[model samples]
Target chain A: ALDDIDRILVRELAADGRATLSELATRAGLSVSAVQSRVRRLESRGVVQGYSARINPEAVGHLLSAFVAITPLDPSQPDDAPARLEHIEEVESCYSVAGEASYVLLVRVASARALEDLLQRIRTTANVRTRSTIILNTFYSDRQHIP
Target chain B: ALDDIDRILVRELAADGRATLSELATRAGLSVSAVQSRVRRLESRGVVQGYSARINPEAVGHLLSAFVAITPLDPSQPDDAPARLEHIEEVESCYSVAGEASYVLLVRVASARALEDLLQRIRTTANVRTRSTIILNTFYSDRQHIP
Candidate 1:
C-alpha cells in the first residue's frame, strides 16, 4: 500500500517522530505540502498510529521489567483479557499469542515487591494463570523496521 | 532524579513526541525556554532517549510476529549474542532474561516461511536454541508509562 517515497517518509518518522514537514520534504525530494498530504494520508489509513518519546524505564524508576505470559483459568470465559488489563498502567505491551499461554504482557515496575504485587493483581483481575520471565537487561528494543 | 514537573513533562512528551516547545510550556506552566531546557536535560541524561512514530507492523508488511526465547548451546561462550544479532533488522527487541532461556527476541516477518527461515538463521548466527511464540494479535503495545 506504500510507495518508495511513502516508505522513506515512514522510516524518517519512525526514527524521529519530531521530524518537521520541511525536513521530510527535503529527504523525500518533494514539496512540504506534498509531504504533509502524504503524512495525513498515512495517519488516516492507520499506518502511522501515533508518535511517542522512547523513555528509559530505569530512569523513570521502573527498575524491574518482565514478560508475563497469562492463560485464562476458565476456557469458557469471554476473551476480554486485553480490555480487562487495559487500565493496568504497568503493563507496557500485551499480545495474544499462539502458544501455551493466551497472552503475554510486558510489565515494568519499581521493585521486586512491586512485581510480586503486580503478578497477584494480574491473576485476580484477569482470572488467568501467570508465568513471568524477568528481563535482566535490555540489549536493544523499539527498533521498528519499515519493510 | 525527576521532580513532579519533570514527570508531567515526560508524560506529555511520551504521549505526543511532536508536541511543540510552546505546547509543552503551556502544559507545564513554564516558559518555552524552560521547557526546552528541561527537554534538553532529559535527552542529555538519557531519560528521553529519542522520539519515534508507532507504525502498524501489519501495515508495513510484517504479517507474522513472534517472541523467540533462546538458550545458548554453549553456556561458556562470551555473552555477545546481542551484538551478533544487532544487524538483523527483523529482530525488533532483544532482552536478556533470567529464565530457562538466556534471551528473548521480538521478531517481525513477512510470512510463516520467513519466520521459519529467521529461526534457523537466529539459531545459527547466535548459536542458541529457539522457542517461538507466534503473536496472533497485538492487543496494545508501546505504551510506555512514567512513574
Candidate 2:
C-alpha cells in the first residue's frame, strides 16, 4: 500500500520520530511542505501509529516482567484472544503462535505478589492457561525493522 | 533518578513524543522554559534514548514473527549476545531472563526462509541455543507502562 517515498518516510519515522521536517525533507528528496503532507497521508492511512518514547519499565514501578505462554481451552475455535486480554492492565504484548501454547504474552508487574495476583486473574479469564518465564535482565529491547 | 516533574515529562513523551513544549509544560505543571531545561537535562542523562513511532511488522515485509528462548553455554559467565543478535536485521527485541532460558528474543522475519536463516545465525553466537515459537497472529504489541 506504500509507494517508495511513503516507505522512506515511515522508515525514517521508525528510526527517529521526532526528526524535524527539514531533516526529513532532505532524506525524502522533497520540500518541507511536501514531506509534511506525505507523512500526514501515511498517518491517515494507518501506516504510522503514533510517536512515542521507548521507556524503561523499572523506572516506573514495573520491576517484575515475564513472558506467558497461554494454552486455549479450544484450539479449534477462532483465536482472537487479545480482545479479552487487552483489558488486563499488565498485559503489554500478545501474540498467537504455532506451538503447544496458542498465545504468548509479555507482561510486567510491580512485584512477585502482584504477579501472583495477575496470574490468578489470567487463570480466571475463561478457557486459557499460561506458563511464565520471569525476566531478570534486558540486554537490549530497542531495534527497528526497515524494509 | 526522576523527580515527580521528570516522571511526568517522560510519561507525556511516552504518550505522544510529538507533543509541543507548551503541551508538555502543561502536563508537568511547569513553565515552558523550565520544561525545556528539564528536558535537556533528561536527554543528556540518557533517560530518553530517542523518540520513535510504534509500527506493525507486516507493513514493512516482516510478516512472520516468533519468540526465541535462548540458553547460554555458560550461565554464570557474562555473555555479549546482543552484539551478534543486534546485527541480524530481523531481531526486534532481546531480553535476559530467569528460569530455564538465559535470554528471550522477539524476532520478525519477512518469510519462513528468512526466519530459518536468522535462526542458523543465532546458533552461531557463542554459547547459545534457541527454541523458537512461530507467531501466527498478534493480539496487540504497542502498549506503554503508565506511572
Candidate 3:
C-alpha cells in the first residue's frame, strides 16, 4: 500500500521511467532524499518494477500482434504448461486466469505467415488446445491514475 | 502503401504521438511545410492513424496480462466475431489472424478471479472451441525507434 507521496512518485515514474530522483521529488512536492528513499523502498517492496524502454514493434517489422487462449488437457496440474510457454520467443506474455479459458498469450511476429508458423509450434509441440485473436486497433488503454 | 516521406512521418508519430509538424520536420530532415503536406496525405490515405498516449497497465493495478487465442466455430466469418468480443470490458484488444486459431484477445483483469470470469464468458458465449498457454513473464516488448 502507498501513501499520497508514494502514489505521486509512481505517477511521475509511469509517465517517464527514466525520471531522476531530483525531478521526481520536485514533481511530488517532497525532499529529494525523501523521494529517493521512498522510491528505493518501493523497488524493494516490488511495487516499482525495473525501468523499460517501450519500443514500437511495427516499426521493426513485427507487424503482427495476436492473443492466444490455452487450456490444459489435465486441469489437475496447470503448472506444467506454463514452463513450456515461457520458452517460446514469439510469446510476449502469458497468464493463467480463473475464467472460462485457462490461459492467455501475447505474441508478435514479422507477418501473417510468421504467426501461422508460431501457432503451429504452440499447437502441435506444446500440446496446447488453443484459440487466438489478432488485434486490429487499440481504442483505449487506461492512462489515467487509479482512483 | 507509403513512400519514403510517409514512412518518416509515420515513424515520427509512432515515437511521439504529440509531435508537432515542425518537430516532425526537424526529425525527418525536411521543411515544416513539406512534412505537414506529407502528413496530410498520409492521413487521407488512411496510412497514418490518429495519435494516442501509451498507458502502463501494471501501474493501474491491472497487473495481470493474458493472451487468449479464440477460434470461432466458423473460421470464414472472422469479421462477425470481433463485434461480439467488443462487448467484453476485460478484453482490451482482439485480433483476427491467419494461423492455427481464428482470433487472439489481449485481456487485463483486476484479479485472478476476474480473469476466470472473463475466460468463462468467452468460452461459453463465444463458443470458443479450444484454448492454450499462460505466460508468466515478459522478457522484452521492443520499444526503441527504428532507423
Query: How do all models score by TM-score?
Result: 0.98, 0.90, 0.56
Q: For residues B74-146, what per-residue lDDT tens digits would candidate 1 score against the true structure?
A: 8678878889999999999999999999999999999999999999999999889999999999988989899
Poorest lDDT segment (10 consecutive residues) of candidate 2 chain A: A72-81
User: Residue by residue across A1-147, what tens digits does model 3's lDDT show?
Assistant: 768887777767656655776888888888988887998887787666555434445644678776677776667764565568666766776656656666666677888898888888887655768877676654433233432
Off by over 4 Å in 2: A74-80, B1-3, B73-77
Query: What TM-score results for chain B in every one of the models?
Result: 0.97, 0.86, 0.79
In lDDT terms, which candidate is top? 1
Write the residue-wise lDDT of candidate 3 on B1-147 in tens digits: 346766676666655654677777777898988887886766665554344333445655776766677777764554465677667766765656667766666677677787788788888777676463344554433233333
lDDT of 1 by residue, A73-120 (tens): 997967878999999999989999996999999999999999999999
**Which model, 2 or 3, shows the larger DockQ?**
2
Distance from true location, Cα of B38 in model 1, Å = 0.5
Of candidate 1 chain A, the 10-residue stretch with the lowest lDDT total is: A75-84
Instruction: Chain A only: list TM-scores of all candidates.
Output: 0.97, 0.88, 0.88
Candidate 2 residue-wise lDDT, A77-134, digit = tens: 7655688777887898888889888788889999999998888788777358878989
| Model 1 docking tier (incorrect/acceptable/medium/high) | high
> Which candidate do you rate higher for TM-score, 2 or 3?
2
